[PDB]
């Protein structure tokens, strides 16, 4: 069956729900991969289409186009898995151990033949998934490396957060890629970040704390902060709105949304444990699917 | 392997006598560093200034065989309490001259003979000798089981008790205040003893056992064997593993010297298997520390597997629920009645597991709470609850005095008992849990009881004697109890019943507050060094466990008994009494133990205020 | 003759484990006794309340096995000298569950990692682990010989030795110079001089950590270390440190540390006091 | 060594002692005339009855001095006389039978365990040490805070406590023969003392140390303390130790402090403490000195611990207590 701890959730362009579940209690600490074409039958085994397990526990998942799925293991591994369709089944093309420690992050850019791994080992590594091998590692990070996100539209550009307290902005191009965002208050450490789709230059990040920040790149004195948690921040995701929402996650085991103007809308109390994971609908984009500790699948709404 | 030396009275060519003695299967010599006829002058010409070497020299051996190989023998010449004041002042040079130049040599050991009751001045010379810097040399003290005058054949017309020698060795070690340096080398004669007395000679520190050559029989073959009598002699020395020396001609017998050790090898591989021994083995036998304190302290895995090692703890407690299982649910009510059990300090599991087959055993549905305050054993105990056990175990991680219990319980059962009874402080843990028991409830174990009994043990006392530690009262040691074993004291009088615990205490005011005055009467001239405790419990009706003297019920093997030292002993005669005040003090931050001791001489107060020893909460 | 271990970053089985690294050579393992994303509430409901086990039991293996074979790691997201007071106190807590885990075990050994120079709490929260009861256990603290930023690629447009000496230094004299405390360096890419290396050498080292990725490769894709890297093996030979190998797979590196045993330059009242 | 009158019952002439300075007696005396006029109005100047307690009553004095500003401020009070000490509960039922009456309500017990059978609109204590904290006046009333009204007002309603390097060879030494028998040769070192100001010289200005407020609102609460303070030398000295002072609001505007430059009475009322250091530390003008102090309670038992890390890294004194605690 599937472990108790669900670690991650993704929503593919058709409705399908890709989670992710490793033990962290039992004596066996392994992992799982599942795929929910119906998400409200989440997280039944039953009413799944595909599952798998993996060799180790599993931190973090992403989809490659459209069949094919990245995994970030405890073995230090990037895994790509193909969802063989109907033969319920998921078979595994390539394991690559290049980290020397856990990866904690990995993002897929829009292209969907690239992606990029951030691990527990500093290293942050950019991967060819076509010649199932990797590009380039940057060892910029001085510490452990958080969250990876690729910036959408752009193969050449990512960010990167770590517990160094460095917010990275990348560009494969220069000789010297990565370069330091800074605002006010960022000298707490950054534990998630994400891109803002319909904004320039703009990106949301979390801390250890609870803030939830909204940074333009350019003009970074104008970046809006709020105390949206208590603890550290687990995940961030924007909708699919013109005007996007932002949905946060966090260690104290709520889920919030905020608007354009960094406002709150929704609270969610219903977890009883580190909610780990959110993911917005393709089909209702009022409809956002978050994960936790508490092995509970919850889907929400919009008012 | 039996580790045997030889014993010579002369050595010509020590080269030769090693590589002799070395293929007859010996592993070391006891021969004299100077010649035993060798007699000197110090104090008066002309044989004062006698000229050439006072004895061979130490460039004859290495190092390596100066100190594997060879143990000293003092010169018999020397009679350090001769009543002779010339002869003793010679004496006192000549011993201080053989024992710096054996720690010169830096032997292992050293032997010195006593040969009479006064050896007064040889004390003295002795420990000065360990004093002066000169150590690490053991002293081993020839003392034969038997007086010399005591073992002679009755030849005389005009001239026709045992423990005569015992009294040679125990003057000597008091008076050399129980020297670590200083211990026991026995001579075995052709007459024995009494078993007690060699029970007490084997108490001693006893390093090596002399075998004359001259009590072994012949055989119709020609070889050397023992008496019956000694072979259960040299089985008992066996077990300490000390050293044998064979002293003496080997032409008492048609062979040589290795058909000795040969014989001993074969005592050896053919002495008796040991039972109602081995439980401490090998071993708890000088077993010297300070009590567990379970509650105060979190008990490691490595010590939880020692308690859960006893089969005989685990079939009475599941015999115990067995028992009450069957007659507090009758057969008509076999499975719409439901027994509430809750497992107070689970520990890794073994109580509730007993519980569970015991449920089984009996036919009866039990809903169990399996509660735990130490952090670690709780994992443990959500181990089998997400493995084996399943949802009616509820695992509780807390104290259980403190833990709020949504259903009042039909049975709680503990093993929160110590070598004390109630030294871990189970009353104190059981009262704070007694309210969440059912007003018809049953407690596991149901009562228990702690005994005194007034005991004689050098040993133990110079060993707690030992036990000063820096930064504290340095008589400190002597208020507080020990968990010792029981061959290692001798016990005076029959236990006395101290302290009673029952669960639940439906008592008006509950108060573990406790005092009473034991007497004991003496039948022996002996010395007071303590008192041994004991205790015994009752898990469930007839079904019991005890660690009292001459209890028929099982449990004898289940605890090491306990020790309360006192600081000034006291000699004793027989008919006199002894009356030991015991208190048992609980302040509400701690629990201690109070005595004192007003018969036949009124000693002081024992840890006055647990100056000197607690126990937590 | 060379006495090794394996560090591993987390374990799936360690029955299997323990077999699988046995068969590669090495004599202990360096591994978690807590899984190191199993991040826990002691303060904040409900996560507070989390149910079923925090670990995998005692039970998995023997106690001699606990004792001899088994080297426990701190979790690394505790920070017990977070400038936030909520991380601080939950840390606080975190720190004394582990600790008293490995002694509930019977570990001979614990890893406490130094990542800054500040330690001040844990010291504080180590020496009293020590003073109270719990014993037995050698505690390595795993310090750095260069500073990860110091290491690191210059890749930041924007923000381009002694150092990690203070870390153990001043820990160290915190901690009152205790007998139960221990060093274990992790050798880097780039080693500090010579003098500064003696003087780590100086310290009660009981390990040395050798990441997979300071290996070079050479013609016949065999592990191998530079000289520099070399001499610095050769001293830690005569000290009979133990050396754990961390990192990757991508494993017999101990070969090349047996090669450069048996081919060692020649040359034990070094310690005496009286 | 400091007093404490939560382990241990004073004796009569100790408190004698204590109830010798005016100052204490007029500024709690004004505590509750300000507190009383803010909470009852003019129109309810008899349709009002304030509920106060003391808590830690002694032998009378903040109990008439609670009296005597309900008159001066003409409102009515029903008071509750609580004290642990069963001696002081003697004194304590003098005065009830002969001079206060039925609206005194004697109470015999523990704060903290005292089952009050009606709430209290005022709460007021004298648990304050040299250190402010020392004589575990939170934890006292922490547990007392539980029979306070939501809208109460503590008295104190807050205190803060103080360090400060210090260069003081005269006390170094006088703490260096303070060695007993029977235990650590170096235990006097590992705790604090109640000093004199002229026998030490501050060497910079104190910081603020931790600080407690009544009554505490906080989610989880925890009187466990840990805190950095640094100073800059200006002098060619040794650093002997950290004096300890405090500061405390009793009611708005109301204070007490034993601070150095301090414009608010009570600088008479309390003798600073002294925190000593077994390795005295010669320093330069221009050095800094950080040290880690750390408050801790057990359940069982509360004490300090400190450090210096700065010029010269010290090691942590008194480790668990083992030298110096402070019962309940
Ligand atoms: N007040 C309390 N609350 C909860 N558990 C307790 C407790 N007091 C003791 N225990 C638990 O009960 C167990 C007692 S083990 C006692 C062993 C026994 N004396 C023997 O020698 O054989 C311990 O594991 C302890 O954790
Ligand atoms: N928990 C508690 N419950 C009841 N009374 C307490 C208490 N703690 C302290 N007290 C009482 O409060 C009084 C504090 S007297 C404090 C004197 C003050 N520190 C000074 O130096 O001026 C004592 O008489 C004591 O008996």
Request: glycine content about 6%; hydrophobic content about 35%; some cysteine.
């Amino acid at each position: 069956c599937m472990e108790v701890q669900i670690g991650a959730v993704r929503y593919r362009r058709d409705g399908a729900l890709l989670l992710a579940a490793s033990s962290l209690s039992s004596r066996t600490w392994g992992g799982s991969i599942w795929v929910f074409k119906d998400p409200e039958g989440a997280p039944n085994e039953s009413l799944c289409t595909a599952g798998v397990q993996t060799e180790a526990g599993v931190t973090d998942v992403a989809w490659v186009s459209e069949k094919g799925i990245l995994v970030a293991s405890d073995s230090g591994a990037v895994e790509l898995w193909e969802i063989l369709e109907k033969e319920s089944l998921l078979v595994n093309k390539f394991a690559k151990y290049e980290h020397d420690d856990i990866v904690k992050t990995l993002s897929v850019f829009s292209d969907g033949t690239q992606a990029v791994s951030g691990g527990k080992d500093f290293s942050v590594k950019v991967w060819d998934l076509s010649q199932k091998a990797v590009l380039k590692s940057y060892n910029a990070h001085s510490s452990e490396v958080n969250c990876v996100a690729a910036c959408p539209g752009k193969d050449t550009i990512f960010l990167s957060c770590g517990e160094d307290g460095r917010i990275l902005l990348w560009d494969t191009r220069k000789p010297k890629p990565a370069t330091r965002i800074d605002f006010c208050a960022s000298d707490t450490i950054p534990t998630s970040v994400t891109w803002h789709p319909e904004k320039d230059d703009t990106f949301a990040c979390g801390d250890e704390t609870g803030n939830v920040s909204l940074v333009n790149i350019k003009n970074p004195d104008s970046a809006q902060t709020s105390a949206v948690h208590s603890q550290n921040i687990t995940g961030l995701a924007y909708s699919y709105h013109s005007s996007p929402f932002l949905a946060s996650i966090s260690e104290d085991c709520t889920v919030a949304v905020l608007d354009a103007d960094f406002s709150e809308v929704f609270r969610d109390l219903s977890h009883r444990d580190f909610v780990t994971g959110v993911a917005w609908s393709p089909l209702d984009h009022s409809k956002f699917t978050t994960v936790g500790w508490d092995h509970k699948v919850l889907h929400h709404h919009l008012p | 392997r039996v580790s045997s030396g030889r014993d010579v009275a002369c050595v010509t060519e020590v080269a030769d006598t090693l590589g002799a003695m070395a293929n007859q299967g010996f592993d070391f010599l006891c021969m004299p560093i100077f010649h035993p006829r060798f007699k000197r002058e110090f104090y008066k010409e002309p044989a004062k200034s006698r000229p050439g070497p006072q004895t061979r020299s130490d460039l004859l051996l290495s190092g390596r065989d100066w100190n594997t190989l060879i143990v000293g023998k003092l010169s018999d010449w020397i009679k350090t309490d001769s009543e002779v004041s010339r002869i003793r002042k010679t004496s006192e040079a000549a011993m201080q001259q053989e024992l710096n130049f054996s720690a010169y040599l830096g032997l292992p050991a050293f032997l010195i003979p006593l040969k009479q009751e006064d050896n007064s001045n040889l004390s003295r010379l002795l420990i000065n000798h360990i004093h002066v810097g000169h150590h690490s040399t053991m002293f081993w003290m020839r003392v034969p089981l038997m007086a010399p005058n005591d073992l002679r054949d009755d030849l005389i017309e005009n001239e026709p008790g045992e423990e005569r020698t015992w009294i040679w060795w125990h003057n000597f070690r008091s008076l050399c205040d129980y020297n670590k340096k200083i211990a026991l080398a026995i001579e075995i004669g052709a007459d024995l003893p009494s078993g007690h007395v060699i029970d007490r000679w084997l108490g001693e520190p006893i390093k090596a056992a002399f075998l004359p050559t001259s009590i072994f029989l012949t055989n119709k073959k020609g070889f050397p064997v023992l008496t019956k009598v000694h072979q259960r002699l040299i089985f008992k020395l066996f077990k300490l593993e000390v050293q044998f020396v064979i002293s003496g001609s080997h032409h008492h017998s048609e062979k040589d010297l290795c058909s000795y050790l040969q014989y001993l090898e074969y005592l050896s591989q053919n002495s008796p298997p040991p039972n109602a021994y081995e439980m401490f083995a090998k071993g708890y036998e000088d077993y010297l520390q300070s009590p567990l304190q379970p509650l105060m302290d979190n008990l490691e895995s490595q010590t939880y597997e020692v308690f859960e090692k006893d089969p005989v703890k685990y079939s009475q407690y599941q015999q115990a629920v067995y028992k009450c299982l069957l007659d507090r649910v009758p057969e008509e009510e076999k499975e719409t009645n439901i027994q509430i059990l809750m497992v107070l300090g689970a520990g890794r599991g073994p109580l509730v597991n007993a519980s569970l087959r015991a449920a089984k055993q009996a036919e009866r549905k039990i809903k169990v709470y399996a509660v735990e305050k130490n952090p670690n054993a709780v994992i443990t105990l959500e181990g089998w609850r997400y493995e084996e056990w399943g949802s009616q175990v509820t695992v509780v991680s807390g104290d259980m005095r403190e833990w709020k219990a949504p259903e009042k319980a039909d049975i709680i059962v503990s093993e929160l008992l110590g070598s004390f009874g109630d030294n871990e402080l189970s009353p104190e843990c059981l009262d704070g849990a007694q309210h969440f028991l059912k007003d018809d409830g049953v407690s596991i174990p149901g009562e228990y009881t702690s005994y005194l009994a007034p005991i004689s043990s050098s040993k133990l006392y110079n060993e707690v004697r030992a036990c000063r530690e820096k930064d504290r009262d340095p008589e400190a040691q002597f208020e507080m109890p020990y968990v010792v074993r029981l061959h290692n004291f001798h016990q005076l009088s029959d236990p006395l019943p101290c302290f009673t615990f029952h669960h639940p205490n439906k008592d008006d005011v509950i108060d573990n507050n406790r005092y009473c005055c034991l007497q004991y009467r003496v039948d022996l001239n002996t010395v007071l060094h303590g008192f041994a405790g004991y205790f015994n419990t009752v898990l469930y009706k007839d079904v019991t466990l005890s660690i009292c003297p001459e209890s028929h019920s099982p449990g004898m093997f289940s605890w090491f008994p306990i020790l309360f030292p006192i600081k000034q002993p006291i000699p004793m005669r027989e008919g006199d009494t002894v009356c030991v005040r015991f208190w048992r003090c609980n302040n509400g931050k701690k629990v201690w133990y109070e005595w004192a001791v007003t018969s036949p001489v009124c000693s002081a107060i024992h840890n006055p205020t647990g100056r000197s020893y607690t126990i937590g909460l």
